[PDB]
Design a protein around this ligand. Structure first.
Ligand SMILES: CCCCCCCCCCCCCCCCCC(=O)O[C@H](COC(=O)CCCCCCCCCCCCCCC)COP(=O)(O)OCC[N+](C)(C)C
Length: 307
């Protein structure tokens, strides 16, 4: 299996309940959880990493974890998450074209890793113009992309990042740049935020590592109060709204050489004229860390910048 080609044990300095750092009870809870699922005839996604994410998400309450896992499996099948990557490749050209149209307006890109080896993910929202957004894509379409990225994250990014780190990597280090957004637009996209939060928390438990919100406008705290209601306690604990000295905070978590210059680091693209919103740079692009899973497809087609 592919799980045999990359570390399945987390760093010994990781949080409680993570692969390889279990207490005696958590270990037994894990064996019991798997035993129940096998008995119900489930066969995929029964590895320690996957099951421990569901267990952690429900504080090791086995009954709650089974319910969550069972619901997740139903959703994946009804939604088509299980063949989403396959379906994308069958219609790649068309997909890429649509994806390229939104890149400049809504930059979303991975760029290296944080100090623990987690994929470093960036999103900029100040350039978003809703009126134009609605002419290029739909809300459901955006959710589909989010689901597709979660699957890409799990099959290509996790293995490569884990091999480079020498330990299992299960989460990402996210930076949300709100520079230039208008609070008014923020309120209008609450339903989308809610849908994103629901998919993430219900079907992709424990995928959040560190989540930084920077350049938020005055009064953002008021708007975040509209969001907290549908975020569970653990999720909230991973979100950090940074102030004016945000660069210093990012530097505590991210190597200076991996952090882009505009965020306080020294990282630049091989070709200074290339755009970050067309880039996808990281271990999963390094032949030395790519395994049997093969290399990740290019999200922006021929425009994808990998260095
Ligand atoms: C046709 C258009 C119709 C609707 C279009 C909406 C346009 C977009 C508007 C909102 C965009 C920003 C929404 C925040 C999404 C944050 C990114 C995210 O996925 O958060 C999820 C988690 O969801 C959360 O927990 C939410 C965290 C707090 C979100 C609070 C943001 C506040 C919103 C204010 C911004 C409004 C900007 C104005 C828009 C014009 C994934 O986290 P991760 O670290 O695991 O992600 C990285 C790894 N992958 C990529 C695999 C997930």
């Amino acid at each position: 299996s592919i799980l045999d080609t990359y570390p399945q044990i987390c760093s010994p300095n990781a949080l409680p309940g993570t692969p390889g750092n279990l207490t005696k009870e958590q270990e037994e809870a894990l064996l019991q959880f798997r035993s129940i699922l096998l008995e119900k005839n489930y066969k995929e996604r029964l590895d320690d990493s996957t099951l421990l994410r569901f267990l952690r998400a429900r504080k090791f309450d086995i009954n709650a974890s089974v319910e969550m896992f069972v619901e997740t499996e139903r959703w994946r099948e009804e939604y088509g998450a299980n063949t989403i990557i396959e379906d994308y490749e069958n219609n790649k050209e068309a997909e890429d074209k649509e994806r390229i149209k939104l890149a400049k307006m809504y930059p979303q890109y991975y760029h290296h890793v944080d100090k623990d080896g987690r994929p470093l993910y960036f999103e900029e929202l100040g350039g978003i113009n809703l009126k134009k957004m609605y002419k290029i894509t739909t809300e459901k379409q955006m959710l589909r992309n989010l689901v597709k990225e979660y699957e890409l994250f799990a099959t290509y990014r996790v293995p490569a990042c884990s091999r480079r780190a020498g330990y299992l990597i299960e989460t990402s280090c996210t930076v949300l740049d709100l520079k230039g957004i208008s609070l008014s637009n923020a309120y209008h996209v609450l339903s989308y935020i809610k849908d994103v939060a629901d998919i993430s928390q219900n079907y992709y438990p424990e995928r959040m590592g560190k989540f930084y919100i920077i350049h938020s406008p005055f009064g953002f705290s008021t708007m975040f109060k509209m969001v907290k209601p549908f975020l569970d306690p653990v999720t909230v604990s991973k979100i950090f709204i940074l102030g004016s000295s945000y660069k210093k905070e990012l530097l505590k978590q991210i190597p200076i050489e991996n952090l882009p210059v505009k965020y306080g680091g020294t990282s630049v693209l091989h070709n200074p004229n290339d755009k970050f919103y067309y880039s996808d740079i990281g271990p999963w692009r390094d032949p030395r860390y790519i395994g049997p899973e093969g290399e990740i497809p290019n999200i922006f087609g021929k425009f994808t910048v990998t260095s």
